[PDB]
Paper text:
BD-FAE, a previously unknown protein encoded in a metagenomic PUL from beaver droppings belongs to the functionally diverse α/β-hydrolase superfamily. We demonstrated that BD-FAE removes feruloyl and acetyl groups from simple model substrates, acetyl groups from birchwood glucuronoxylan, and feruloyl groups from highly substituted AcFaXOS from corn fiber. The His-tag was not visible and the N-terminal tail showed weaker electron density than other residues of the protein, most likely due to its flexible protruding nature. Overall, the BD-FAE crystal structure adopted a typical α/β-hydrolase fold, which was consistent with the above mentioned BLASTp results. The active center contained the conserved catalytic triad of Ser128, Asp237 and His269 and the oxyanion hole was composed of NH-groups of Gly53 and Ser128.
The final model of BD-FAE was refined to 2.06 Å resolution and it contained the residues from Gln2 to Glu292. In the crystal structure of BD-FAE, a sulfate ion was bound to the active site, which originated most likely from the ammonium sulfate containing crystallization solution. It mimicked the binding of an acetyl group to the catalytic triad. Looking at the surface model it can be seen that the active site was solvent exposed and formed a shallow furrow. The N-terminal tail (Gln2-Pro7) protruded out of the core protein and packed against an adjacent symmetry molecule in the crystal. Such crystal packing did not form a closed-ended dimer but an unusual fourfold spiral shaped polymer, in which the active sites pointed to the center of the spiral. In crystals of BD-FAE, the protruding N-terminal tail packed as a β-strand against a small β-sheet on the surface of another molecule, leading to an unusual fourfold spiral shaped polymer.
Author numbering: 2 to 292
The structure:
């Protein structure tokens, strides 16, 4: 009757909540995040960072990501930290990834204050958030990436915790676009009308091999990189299934560890956010948290 779309995780799934905390020591809402500790109270919680999907367009949707995936993470026993990032329309790449990295230095540096054990900081996201999650899980320890004559600052200088590591320990990628060389028909780059074109500054990806390489985490997968779980629906009409197939193939051929879960009849979210696959995520994140 009076209806309210779910805003953040349900109230009974957490004991403690800090909302609209800035992680960049500035005044931008694109640089805020929210933190939730489980109901089952403990001395410390290992942490999972989450990122909304939005074709990189949104800068204010951390409550959607919380509402979608936060409850199973809280019930599994992890602190859940949901972040904002800047819109592709207000800062082109690498801005989004510098935001994620800054958010990570924030969580790790201040873990104690939030009763976070920084022993483990996993990361997850859906769609473009899954992209950003994955881009972090293949760039632990990297401050710039260069392709041809193009150089991008991945770590950035955002905020006041630059000495703290900006690394993540495990990744769950929910149907993210991770191979932009093959987004069109799964064989080619898209044209300049698409969200990756805006991400690289309204250039035609078909003309920009270097930009396309440096927004595509599939290009940096290494044997030693943190393990990853990839979940994609085989009827996804927005980001094609082939993306996740490719990412898994690359993890497999580089000597790294990827699990790929394909969701039959799964849309771009629909059918994928079932108990079954939330469990795949929480089981994964638990095994990683303990190993």
């Amino acid at each position: 009757q009076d209806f309210q779309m779910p805003k953040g995780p349900a109230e009974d799934t957490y004991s403690t909540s800090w909302t609209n905390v800035n992680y960049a020591s500035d005044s931008l809402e694109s640089h805020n995040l929210d933190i939730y500790l489980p109901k089952e109270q403990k001395t410390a919680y290992k942490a999972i960072i989450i990122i909304y999907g939005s074709a990189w367009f949104a800068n204010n949707a951390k409550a959607m990501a919380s509402a979608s995936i936060g409850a199973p993470l809280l019930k599994a026993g992890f602190a859940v930290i949901s972040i904002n990032h800047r819109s592709s329309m207000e800062a082109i790449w690498p801005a989004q990834i510098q935001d994620v990295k800054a958010a990570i230095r924030y969580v790790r540096s201040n873990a104690a204050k939030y009763n976070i054990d920084p022993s483990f900081i996993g990361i997850t996201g859906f769609s473009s958030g899954g992209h950003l999650s994955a881009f972090a899980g293949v760039t632990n320890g990297v401050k710039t990436l260069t392709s041809g004559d193009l150089t991008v600052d991945i770590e950035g200088s955002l905020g006041n915790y630059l000495s703290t590591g900006s690394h993540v320990d495990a990744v769950v990628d929910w149907f993210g676009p991770v191979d932009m060389a093959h987004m069109s028909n799964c064989v080619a780059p898209n044209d300049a009308s698409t969200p990756e074109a805006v991400l690289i500054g309204k250039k035609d990806p078909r003309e920009e091999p270097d930009w396309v390489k440096l927004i595509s985490p599939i290009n940096f997968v290494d044997k030693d990189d943190p393990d990853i779980l990839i979940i994609h629906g085989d009827a996804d009409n927005v980001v094609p299934h082939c993306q996740s197939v490719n990412l898994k193939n690359v993890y497999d051929n580089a000597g790294a560890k990827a699990t790929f879960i394909s969701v039959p009849g799964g849309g771009h979210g629909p059918g994928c956010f079932d108990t079954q696959y939330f469990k795949d995520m929480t089981d994964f994140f638990t095994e990683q948290s303990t190993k």
